[PDB]
Structures are given as structure tokens and as C-alpha cells.
Amino acid sequence: DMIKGKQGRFRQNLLGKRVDYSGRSVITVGPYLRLHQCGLPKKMALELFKPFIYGKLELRGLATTIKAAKKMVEREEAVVWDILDEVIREHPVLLNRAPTLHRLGIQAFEPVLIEGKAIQLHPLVCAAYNADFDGDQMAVHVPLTLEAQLEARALMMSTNNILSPANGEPIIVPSQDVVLGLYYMTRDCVNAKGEGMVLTGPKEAERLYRSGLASLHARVKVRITEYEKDANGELVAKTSLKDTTVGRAILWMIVPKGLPYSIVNQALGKKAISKMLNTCYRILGLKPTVIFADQIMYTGFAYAARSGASVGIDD
Amino acid sequence: TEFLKPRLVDIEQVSSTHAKVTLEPLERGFGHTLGNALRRILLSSMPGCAVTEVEIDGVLHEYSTKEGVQEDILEILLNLKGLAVRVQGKDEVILTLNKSGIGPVTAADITHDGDVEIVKPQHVICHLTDENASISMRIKVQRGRGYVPASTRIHSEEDERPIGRLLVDACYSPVERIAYNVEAARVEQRTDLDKLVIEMETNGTIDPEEAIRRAATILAEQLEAFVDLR
Amino acid sequence: EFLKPRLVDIEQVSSTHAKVTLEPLERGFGHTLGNALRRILLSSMPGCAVTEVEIDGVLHEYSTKEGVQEDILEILLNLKGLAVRVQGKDEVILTLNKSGIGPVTAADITHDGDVEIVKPQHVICHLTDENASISMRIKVQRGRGYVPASTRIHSEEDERPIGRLLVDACYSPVERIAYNVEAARVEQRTDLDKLVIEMETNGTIDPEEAIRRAATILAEQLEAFVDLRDV
Amino acid sequence: PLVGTGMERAVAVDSGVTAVAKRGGVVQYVDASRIVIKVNEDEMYPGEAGIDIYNLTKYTRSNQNTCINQMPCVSLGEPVERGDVLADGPSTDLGELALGQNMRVAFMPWNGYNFEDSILVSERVVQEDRFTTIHIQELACVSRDTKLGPEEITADIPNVGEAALSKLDESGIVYIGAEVTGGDILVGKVTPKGETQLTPEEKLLRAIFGEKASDVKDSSLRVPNGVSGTVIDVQVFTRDGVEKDKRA
Amino acid sequence: ARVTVQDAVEKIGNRFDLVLVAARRARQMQVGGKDPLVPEENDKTTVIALREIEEGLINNQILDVRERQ
Amino acid sequence: GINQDDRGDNMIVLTPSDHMLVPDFPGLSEDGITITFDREVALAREDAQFITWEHPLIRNGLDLILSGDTGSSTISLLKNKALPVGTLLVELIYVVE
Amino acid sequence: IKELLKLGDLPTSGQIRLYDGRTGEQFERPVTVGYMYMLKLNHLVDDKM
RNA sequence: GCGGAGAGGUA
Numbered sequence A: 001d002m003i004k005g006k007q008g009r010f011r012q013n014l015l016g017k018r019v020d021y022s023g024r025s026v027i028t029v030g031p032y033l034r035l036h037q038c039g040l041p042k043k044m045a046l047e048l049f050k051p052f053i054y055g056k057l058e059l060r061g062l063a064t065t066i067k068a069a070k071k072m073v074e075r076e077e078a079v080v081w082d083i084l085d086e087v088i089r090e091h092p093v094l095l096n097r098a099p100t101l102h103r104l105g106i107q108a109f110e111p112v113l114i115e116g117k118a119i120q121l122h123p124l125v126c127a128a129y130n131a132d133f134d135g136d137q138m139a140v141h142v143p144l145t146l147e148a149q150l151e152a153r154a155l156m157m158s159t160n161n162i163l164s165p166a167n168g169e170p171i172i173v174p175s176q177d178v179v180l181g182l183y184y185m186t187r188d189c190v191n192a193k194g195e196g197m198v199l200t201g202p203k204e205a206e207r208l209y210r211s212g213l214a215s216l217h218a219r220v221k222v223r224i225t226e227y228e229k230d231a232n233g234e235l236v237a238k239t240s241l242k243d244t245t246v247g248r249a250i251l252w253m254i255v256p257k258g259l260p261y262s263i264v265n266q267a268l269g270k271k272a273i274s275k276m277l278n279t280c281y282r283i284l285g286l287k288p289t290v291i292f293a294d295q296i297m298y299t300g301f302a303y304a305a306r307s308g309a310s311v312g313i314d315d
Numbered sequence B: 001t002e003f004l005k006p007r008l009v010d011i012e013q014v015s016s017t018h019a020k021v022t023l024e025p026l027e028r029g030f031g032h033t034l035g036n037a038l039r040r041i042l043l044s045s046m047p048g049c050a051v052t053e054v055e056i057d058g059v060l061h062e063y064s065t066k067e068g069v070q071e072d073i074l075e076i077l078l079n080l081k082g083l084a085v086r087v088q089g090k091d092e093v094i095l096t097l098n099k100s101g102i103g104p105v106t107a108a109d110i111t112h113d114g115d116v117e118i119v120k121p122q123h124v125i126c127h128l129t130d131e132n133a134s135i136s137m138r139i140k141v142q143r144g145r146g147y148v149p150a151s152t153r154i155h156s157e158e159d160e161r162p163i164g165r166l167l168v169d170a171c172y173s174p175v176e177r178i179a180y181n182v183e184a185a186r187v188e189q190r191t192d193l194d195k196l197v198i199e200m201e202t203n204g205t206i207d208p209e210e211a212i213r214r215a216a217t218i219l220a221e222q223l224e225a226f227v228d229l230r
Numbered sequence C: 001e002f003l004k005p006r007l008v009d010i011e012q013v014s015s016t017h018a019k020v021t022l023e024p025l026e027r028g029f030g031h032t033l034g035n036a037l038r039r040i041l042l043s044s045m046p047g048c049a050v051t052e053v054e055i056d057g058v059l060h061e062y063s064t065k066e067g068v069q070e071d072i073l074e075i076l077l078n079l080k081g082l083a084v085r086v087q088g089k090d091e092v093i094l095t096l097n098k099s100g101i102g103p104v105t106a107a108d109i110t111h112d113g114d115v116e117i118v119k120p121q122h123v124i125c126h127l128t129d130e131n132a133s134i135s136m137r138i139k140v141q142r143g144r145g146y147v148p149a150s151t152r153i154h155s156e157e158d159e160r161p162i163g164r165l166l167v168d169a170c171y172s173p174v175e176r177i178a179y180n181v182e183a184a185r186v187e188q189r190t191d192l193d194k195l196v197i198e199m200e201t202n203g204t205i206d207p208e209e210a211i212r213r214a215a216t217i218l219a220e221q222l223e224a225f226v227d228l229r230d231v
Numbered sequence D: 001p002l003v004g005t006g007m008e009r010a011v012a013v014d015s016g017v018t019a020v021a022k023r024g025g026v027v028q029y030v031d032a033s034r035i036v037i038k039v040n041e042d043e044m045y046p047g048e049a050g051i052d053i054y055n056l057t058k059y060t061r062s063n064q065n066t067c068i069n070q071m072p073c074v075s076l077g078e079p080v081e082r083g084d085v086l087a088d089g090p091s092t093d094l095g096e097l098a099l100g101q102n103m104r105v106a107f108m109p110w111n112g113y114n115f116e117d118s119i120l121v122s123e124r125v126v127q128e129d130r131f132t133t134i135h136i137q138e139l140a141c142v143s144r145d146t147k148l149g150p151e152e153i154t155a156d157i158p159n160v161g162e163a164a165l166s167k168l169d170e171s172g173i174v175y176i177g178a179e180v181t182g183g184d185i186l187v188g189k190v191t192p193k194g195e196t197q198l199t200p201e202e203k204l205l206r207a208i209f210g211e212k213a214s215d216v217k218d219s220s221l222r223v224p225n226g227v228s229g230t231v232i233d234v235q236v237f238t239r240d241g242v243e244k245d246k247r248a
Numbered sequence E: 001a002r003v004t005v006q007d008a009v010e011k012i013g014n015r016f017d018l019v020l021v022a023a024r025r026a027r028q029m030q031v032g033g034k035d036p037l038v039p040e041e042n043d044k045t046t047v048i049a050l051r052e053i054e055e056g057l058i059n060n061q062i063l064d065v066r067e068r069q
Numbered sequence F: 001g002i003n004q005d006d007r008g009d010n011m012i013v014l015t016p017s018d019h020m021l022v023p024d025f026p027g028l029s030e031d032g033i034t035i036t037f038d039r040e041v042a043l044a045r046e047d048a049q050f051i052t053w054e055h056p057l058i059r060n061g062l063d064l065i066l067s068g069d070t071g072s073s074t075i076s077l078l079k080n081k082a083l084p085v086g087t088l089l090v091e092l093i094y095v096v097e
Numbered sequence G: 001i002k003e004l005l006k007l008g009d010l011p012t013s014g015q016i017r018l019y020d021g022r023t024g025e026q027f028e029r030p031v032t033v034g035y036m037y038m039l040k041l042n043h044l045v046d047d048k049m
Numbered sequence H: 001g002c003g004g005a006g007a008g009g010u011a
């Protein structure tokens, strides 16, 4: 019985161990994060990285011996927090969510020290984790050796895993608030403020919208310069007058060079945004796709909040 | 009582017209109040000069066509919208453009007047084709605050004007784009403090730093009347 | 050649509720100033509030006195709401002493010169016994913002007397702020606006001083902006 | 609840958390521990009636470590009838079920801080102190009788600094109302040592110094790591043949 | 922080021995036998070694030649 | 084989260990002793042993080692590219008495 | 519910126009506000962390 | 005071 069976052995103690330098806590939104990072509470970070703290403290000479380093960590003076910030700089941590169904259940992130007792998880990756902010918890492990650090940052980092290993399609597609905001932004209306005025570019579109001289969605003629890598990797600017909404122009600000304008020109729902990300990946590559996804998240969240979408009984 | 004043005003000026500005030390919540006050004042209320109205010697309405310009009229209006001009003494001045021959008629080709300086001489205006290449126009520039679209003036156009009076959007404010992000920043013990990153694009004339300068100056000038605790 | 806004009439409807007007506001600056002031007022107005309390016969917040019906914890909850105005000192020790049957209200506090008890009707306790007597010493400090007990616990600094009862400090007098920018027909101008700031406070900070200090803080930060090193 | 179903009073009354009058009368004495009522002559027993006294229960530990505290509703001189609610139990008001609290919500996405089922909350909520709960942990130190000798509860604990004893009384128990933190000594206990076999010079040194061969080891209970609160109550249970301590 | 290693994997297409060469380099850097060939911007030695790999200065063969030298 | 717990405030607590090297140490006890090397701490903490070169603990350990024969003979290898293979270096510690 | 809202002198549709506390600008399309009875469940992060 | 049962709960 000790050997056989789930609770006994091989399953329990030889494929299912219980690592050190690990923690657990409740997950939270943290929209401001970069795709490759995660909000980590100070106190857990100190607890996890304790031996790193001692090593760095001794290197800097702040502590004569290891016991003095321990006492300095247990008082938690400003120097300790400074050393923790310095050591945390490039050190990546592993984030895991209880049912690790597929390999995207474990991903590496760069932590950013924050107050509170909850772990902050980047929104875009929730779909990969199947994470929901209704009391879901996550575990956080620390890779120790140099090879482990390199492996976590290279193989497991969120930005390196944008395509699902099952099928080629993207995993990090915007989920609900982002897509709602973008949808609100791109949809047009027959008549509003600033119908049919001609704008020299998206920047004055934003000038108009944020100053309240034009509606966030209103049909308008704008001059836009799209870039196309038609040659052997060179970008050629084509600049013409398109008939679009203010919102579509506002969104166009983020979009990297290589992509056709058409991409944003439509209603921009869930599918449209997903295929937008798809084309951005296929044409440009990884890094532009990552930054573009982050930009999409930020703009979607912002303009969803500006929209003020609610649900009344009469809706 | 004793507040926390910002230090370390770093400015990453990539592409001279585009400036990122960071202010890491502050007090909780002042990030959005200060960022937004600055943003709105910069964007909506900034004294500047811009083209307002135009009379074309050849065309009576904005949808008609001139022979030998491939660009439509709307493109010429849009090109005229981008002109960033600074006049020193005079309040309202009327520049003339007259060009012939092949090529791109650019802002430099305008007649060089005394008080008025065009900050971007290479801004394209029109493209003239061969053997006819006749372009002549008179553009009137005025001083004002902020951005004024055509639609709000044309609304109050009961004072009937002769045909050809083509209104143009007035781009007074020198700022083309302005945005601010607020993010967490901690002074070694206090974490509920924030950093303000202000991304600003100006229209050549003044560099962003000085734009911010006169924005804060203007806002302080309005506030001066109440502030007396010193 | 510009305008600039001057502070005009400040109507006081009640001791807590106040309306402040600003007449000559340029177009567009109505909302800017309205919101800036709202933010500064709600966030940064310095006020005084009780930080800790010592009552005689009670070891800790959770015990109970003979002859009172509120729990001690509820007494702290009542004290948190006490609206007081301190003028000169930073920490004052108020003394409440009452005996006999009756409601111990805020008015019964020992009357000191520098401290003003804004709402003397504010109830604290109810005695229910002829020989039941309550004595307490309430320590009131000046501060800004919101500081809970549990954060200051790191800096205990000899909290050793178990009779000490720490209270969360809400160092903020302002409860509510609204503003309206409305057309200010000035006899020689077309489109000017007047800002009306309607504010509800616990009745410690006066409107004029609140608005002045807020404008001060905003002007100071703008001062920080005027200079730009570029070094 | 601002929006209830009417069943709140049924639930609150039928649960034992409220204090409910058995014989109606008039409230004679009100305290935050007991409500004393003078019975009405109708319900008053002819022979050996007297008055009714209801002792309330103040902060005690529930199974889930929450607080169970009753507050009085009524005031001096108010008449009460059989089956009215004198005192409110935990999370009940004036007889009604108040499971939580009712706050002003707005349905909107606010810069994805309420992205998923997550909730955004205003600092006014913590300021108004409306979601602060009291919890209550119980800790037990047991002194048994070993065959090497019974353990002791004394405050004399080997090789502890006087800092740790400062908050302990002479009997070795924390003062009621003292604020403790993780690692602080919750109560003092000593583990007996046997077969010490000290050298004769060491035995002479022990007599002058006062060093105890019997102790040299500490079984004192300590507050668990990372939990910090105020000691509100202490209880002591002795068996037959055990002297009562001061706390007792 | 170095958010993408895409150029380093474009240098060595296996994407696995990349990790090995970067680990060897960063281990020669941490235990201070060697010195970084790139100006550090307060990065730790892992991201330093990746930054060096993406700039083409270090690979396995350069490691072997320098070690035998 | 004496465990040295560093309490932190210039005070070391010495306790023996399961792997100590001698049957009994003259001064040591299993309950341990606290020491300080700073004369001022010793003047403030009379419960600690003031350790100097002349303190019995050190003189005791010295006699214990220099009378015993542990540490008198060992071998060691050297990996140095800048020397010939199989070379012989011999450390010899004579004692004049 | 509509009647009860009317008796209080509140919008009958149960939605109100709201101003963004950070920016001061109005939200398009008024939003539902009102009092709801909410509960704090026994799952407290400090116990979980 | 390492363990294992039983009960309940979380995602």
C-alpha cells in the first residue's frame, strides 16, 4: 500500500514532491503589468529569496556573518528592501495555477514588488492559465541555479509562449474587458458630434476625442500612412485618405508598422482582434506581437472604462 | 502639512518632436490629478497661430476639382492644417502661395513675410503636374487658444458669405499628441507613491519641455489669486 | 491680456454644508479646476482626530463596563466620528468624566481653550446605573490622510501600557465634494463660466481655509513644474 | 439588508444568537452584559416569582474562530413582551438577519481593475471601518505529569531574556489586554531535567548562582509565527492536588 | 528586463543548447573568473549573458577557443 | 566541533555538539556558555566570558591541540598548469622548544 | 420598483449619469448605480498567503 | 507533536 496507489509513493513522493522556495496566494488583476511580469507581494518575495538576500548582504558587507544577515532580515530594515529590489531585478519566478492542464499552466515572469498579500497576474495570460479572479489561487516557485534561471526566462516566460502547443493559434487573445473596449471603440454611428470632418491623422483624432470636440465613434475621413514590408524586409509608406471612425484611428496608434490598415477598419470583435494578433505575429514576429498585445490590453481597458458600459433592467 | 515634492525629472527625447518625461517621486493620488490637469490644459487651451479660412481663386466649393493637381482639394486642406506658424507682433496675417512647374509645392515656397516664421519649411502642401502647373491661394492665419473644428463655426453661419469662403480647422495648440501614464513608485518605505510618464508630441515650433513649461505657467497664473499660504 | 478667476461669495447653509463660488473662469478651465480641487480636498485636507484612548476600568477594546450598554469597542467607534478642531498644539489630551444615569454626549468633554468640540450633541455612551461612573482621556492629533492602527503597529514605540486603546486615524474632515461649472454671464463677454464647489464636511475645516490650502498645494506642484533642469 | 425577503426575522429569532424574552415585562436594568426585566403582573407567577435576568455573552470564539458578541437593543424602562428581541446576536440587528452589509455599487469596467469576477472597492469602505471582522484564536498549554517529574508553569524559564518575561506576570501568564506578535512567549512552561550528575564544584556554583538543575530546558508555549493580536481572555484548569495559580 | 530571447534563438536554432551556452557563460561570469564584454545596465548575470549572446560576441565555439587558449 | 550560535549583539553562545573532538571540555557544559570579545560588552554583560588570547578556553584548546597529534599529518593535491607534473613540495613544521 | 424610485425622486430607469472621479469627464451611456447587499466571505487572503 | 482517518470548504 505504501508503494502502490496514489496517496502512497511514486505518484506522491517521487513524481509529486514538495519543493522549497515556494509560495501560494490569491490572484489579482494588475492591468498595468507588462506581458512578461507579475506583481509579487514584498513579504513573500523576501521569504522566498531569503538566501539570496543573505548572500547579497554579505557581499555588500552590510552584515558580518550569516546570523547577522538573518537578524537583519527579521527586522526588515530599508537596506533589506533595497537589496531585495536589486536582487529581484532580472530574477524570474515560476507561476502555477492549481490544475496545470497543459504546459502553459506553468510560466515564468519577472516579479515587481508590491504591497498586499495577493499575487498579481497579467490579464492576457489568464486564458492560458484558465485563471479567474474569484478566489483562484496560484503557487510561485523560485529557480535557483543559473541554468534554471536561463531556462525559466527562455523556455517558460509568458512572452515566449504566445502560441498554443496544441494548435498554432494564439493563446493570449484579449478576453472580455479588452475586447469590449475595442469593440466600443471601432463601432460607428450614423450621426454624432463631428460627423464627416477630415483629420490629418490619428493624433488629432485623439486631440478631438479627449477634448470632447468629437465622439469616440463618429464617421470621419482621415489621412493615414500605413507601412508595408513588400520588398525584402523594407517598409514602404503608403499614405491616403480613408473613411473610418475616430475610434479606429485612436486604435491605429498602437499597431506596428507592417500591418495593413484594413485590420482595424472593421467592427473589431473577438474574432477580429484574434486574427489581428495572428497577422501581426505572422508578418512581424515575436517581440512586436508581444508589445502590440500589451498595447491592445491597455487601450481596451482604458476605453472600456471611458465607455461606461453597464447593464440596467431596461437594457 | 509637510508634502512630498517631486525630484528627478528625467526626459528621454527620442525624435526631437517626441519627448517622454518621467517624475517618480510624488504623493498618493496626485499622479492622476496633476497629469490630467496638465494634459487638458496643454491640449485644449494653448495660445497659438493657425490657418483658419482660405479663398481659392479657381474653385468655389470644397468638392470641385482643379485641372492638373492629382491630389484632391481635401488633401490640400489637410496639408494646410499641418502648417505650424509663429507670428511675433501681428495678430492676424494673410500669406499668399503662388507656384508653377513640376514637383511638390511645399511650405517653403510660400512668400517670405516679416513677422511670420514657418517652423517646418519642408511640409508638403500640393503636387503640381506638367506644363500647366498653376497653383495660387491666399491662406489667412489667426491667433487663438486650442482646437476649433469647422463644424462649430459653420453652425453659426447665418451671416451669408460669398461662395468660395472655405473654412479650415484651426490647429492653434502646438501639441499634436499628449498622454500620461501613472505607475507605482516607492521611496524605500512608502509604496503608495506614483510616477508620471508624460508622452508628448509637438508640432516642431516649440520643443515639448517648453510647451509643458508654459502650460504649468498658465495654470499657475490662473491659480495665483487664491494661493496665499507661503 | 487674459482673465483669471477670483474667489467670490462663500455661502454657508449649515455648519457642515458649504457652497463656494468662483466667478471669472475661462472656458474649459471650469472642469480642470473643479476636478483638481475635488481631488486635493478629498485626499489632502489636514484635520485632527483621536489616535488613542485610555479608559480607566478597561484592559482592552473588547471588555465591557458595568452600567453601560454599548461595548467598549463601540465606544471607540463613536470616538472615531468625533469632529474636533485643534488650533495650536499637535497632541491634546481631552478628559471625559460623567456619573449618574444619562447619555454621555460629546458636550461633557472637559472644556479646553485650544480645542473646539464641533458637535456637542454627538453621543458617546449611555449610563444605566446611579453609581456607575465613566472617566476617560482621549488623545487627539493633527494629520493628513488615513492611517490604521495595524500599520503604525510596526512602530509601536513602547505601546506597553495595556490600558492603551489604539484607534484608526481618519485624518480628513471632508466627507463629500461636488462641483458644477455653469455659464457665468459677464456683462462684457459671451461665454464665461463660474465654478460652484459644494462640500460636506464634519464641521472642522472652514471652507475658505480648505479651498485656499488645496489651491496652495496645487500651485506648489505647478511651481515644481516651472523649472526644468535638462542638465 | 436594504433588499430582503422578510424571512430575516424568522431566521434570526429561530437561531439562538439573539436574546429573546421568556416572560414579558419592563426593562429594569440594561448593561452590556445583562438585561434585567421586571415581569408583568399578568405573567408573574403567584408563588416565588421574582424577576427575569438575561446574561449576555461577549466576544467568545466560534467554531470557525469568529467572534460571537451580543449587543442590547432595548433601553431602560421600555416594556417588553414574550418573544421580543432584547439583544442582537452576531450579525443580526433589531431582530433581523444582517449577514453582511449593503453598499452603493456601480456596474462598469474601471480600467480592468474589475477585469474578471474581481471587485473594486473605495477607500471610504476601509475608512468607515465597515468590513473589519474580529476573529479569535484559542491556544492551549498543557502541563502533564511525566515520570521524570511534573512540568511547571512558573515564570522562571531557563536562558530567556527578561524581555520575554516583561509581559508575563509573576505566575507566568500574559496580562489580559497585552498585544503580542509571532514568536512572543504566549505562556511560561518548564521541562524537567533528570540525571544531571553535576560536578561537586558545579553543584557549589549552582547553590550561589541559583542555577536550577531541574530546569535547563523550556517547554513554554509561544504565539504561532506570523499571528498577532490582543489577549482578551485567559482560563486555567487544575486537577485534584494542584495548587491554584494567581490567574486562577 | 530582457523580455524576448528571439534573436538569441535565431543565432542557434535549437533553442535548447542556447540555454547551455548561456549558462556556461553566465557561470563563468558569476564566479568571477571572467569579465563581461558588454556594458552592464544593472542587470544580473543571466540577462547579461543573453544580451551578450544576442550581440554575436559569444557562442560555443568562442567558448572552446577561449578556454583552450 | 563546538556550535557557535551568533545571537547578534556582540555575544556568541557556544554549545557543544554531537561531533565534538574531546571527552569533556574542561570549561564547557552541555547547556552552553555565552562569550563576548569586546571588553565593553563584557563590562555590561557579566554573564559572558571575556575571551582573549590569555583566556582559559583558548589556552585550554591550545594545550589540547598542541599536545594531541591531530592536524600533524595530511596530504593534498595541487592543480596548477604553471608547474611540472608529479612535482614534490613538502611543508615541514619544526618546533624549537 | 419604478414607482418606489419615483417616490424618492430618482430616475425611473434606475441608471444615473456618472462623472469619472479621476478625469472628471462624463461617461457616455449612463451606468447602473444603487445599493446592493454584499458579504465578505471567510476566505481572507492573509490566511491563504 | 512527524503522521493517518473522518467532516467540511475552496478553484
Ligand SMILES: Nc1ccn([C@@H]2O[C@H](COP(=O)(O)CP(=O)(O)OP(=O)(O)O)[C@@H](O)[C@H]2O)c(=O)n1
Residues within 6 Å of the ligand: A099, A130, A132, H011
Ligand atoms: N469540481 C471542480 C470545480 C471547479 N474546478 C476548477 O474551477 C475552474 C472551473 O472553471 P469553469 O469554466 O467551470 C467556470 P469559469 O472559468 O469561471 O467561467 P464561467 O463562470 O463564465 O462559466 C477550473 O479551473 C477547474 O479546474 C475544479 O478543478 N473541480
Ligand SMILES: [Mg+2]
Residues within 6 Å of the ligand: A131, A132, A133, A134, A135, A136, H011
Ligand atoms: Mg475562479
